[PDB]
């Protein structure tokens, strides 16, 4: 189904990247066009218009991740995520915005609802000066509260690129924690590239082992800024390195179309995409 069989895959990029990526900007603009005949009614309402950091970028109403209404607020039941499908499900995968300062605690109650014991964070906070993200986990020093929701600092490991925080998320009104694990990469610019496929691909090697250890409960939830590119790109390297070993086939631009039609621009620069091919490359030179 326009799957590139595994043995195939490296003269495939080596096509597409003659001629300054000719090949890679003429799939990017066919993917440029999937998705835009869908409604995105909820995630544009006037109750929901301080929820979404940028205008420009919102959910589609049939793949948004829908919270818990609560009773006599309207919009209580949005945020900006949704459902990303990847290897097995429709639903494998969360993709978010960074949390905005008025809806940390909606955050959180993804986070909750939804049972994830896995954030991927793909942003800084702020970048050259520019804020992209709220700092929405606590310090070691003091867990901070979000409606019926405490959050723990339990522990953190900084190293070069990227840092592990562990979390404990407590439900008050029921009495039960959920851990939470928050991958953080920290070199990663916004609408960029990491500095070489070798340092993402050691991100995701150890995010994959916690993963591949780690099933109970929801998807896992990715974000970044807005969400979608950063955030596609690390979904879609994820999902296509464990399709070329478990089904030997790679379909990157079967999945980002897929991708694009739960939520838009996913994979967000022609660069991130054929950044995207390298990794996957780089991944079977080191193999």
């Not at 829908?66 to 945020?79: Q, T, V």
């Not at 190293?159 to 009495?175: D, F, P, S």
């Not at 991958?183 to 995701?204: E, K, N």
């Not at 807005?226 to 079967?254: C, K, Y």
Request: proline fraction near 7%; include cysteine.
């Amino acid at each position: 189904p326009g799957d590139i069989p595994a043995e195939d895959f490296a003269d495939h990029v080596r096509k597409n990247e003659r001629d300054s990526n000719a090949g890679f900007a003429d799939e990017y603009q066919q993917l440029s066009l999937v998705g835009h005949s869908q409604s995105q009614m909820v995630a544009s309402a006037s109750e929901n218009n301080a929820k979404n950091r940028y205008r420009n970028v919102l959910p589609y109403d049939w793949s948004r991740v829908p919270l818990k209404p609560i009773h006599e607020e309207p919009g209580s039941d949005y945020i900006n995520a949704s459902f990303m499908p990847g290897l097995w499900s429709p639903q494998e995968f969360i993709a978010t915005q960074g949390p905005l300062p008025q809806t940390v605690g909606d955050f959180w109650r993804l986070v909750w609802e939804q049972q994830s014991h896995t954030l991927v964070m793909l942003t800084n906070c702020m970048e050259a000066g520019r804020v992209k993200c709220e700092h929405y986990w606590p310090l070691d020093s003091q867990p901070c509260t979000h409606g019926h929701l405490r959050v723990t600092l339990v522990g953190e490991e900084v190293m070069e690129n990227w840092t592990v925080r562990e979390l404990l998320l407590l439900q008050v009104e029921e009495q039960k924690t959920l851990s939470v694990r928050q991958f953080h990469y920290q070199a990663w610019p916004d609408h960029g590239v990491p500095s070489s496929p070798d340092t993402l691909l050691a991100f995701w090697r150890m995010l994959r082992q916690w993963l591949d250890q780690t099933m109970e409960g929801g998807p896992p939830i990715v974000h970044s800024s807005a969400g979608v590119g950063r955030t596609g790109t690390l979904i879609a390297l994820d999902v296509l390195l464990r399709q070329l070993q478990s089904e030997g086939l790679l379909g990157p631009f079967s999945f980002v179309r897929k991708m694009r039609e739960s939520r838009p621009l996913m994979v967000q620069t022609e660069a991130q995409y054929v950044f995207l091919h390298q990794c996957i490359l780089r991944f079977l030179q080191q193999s």
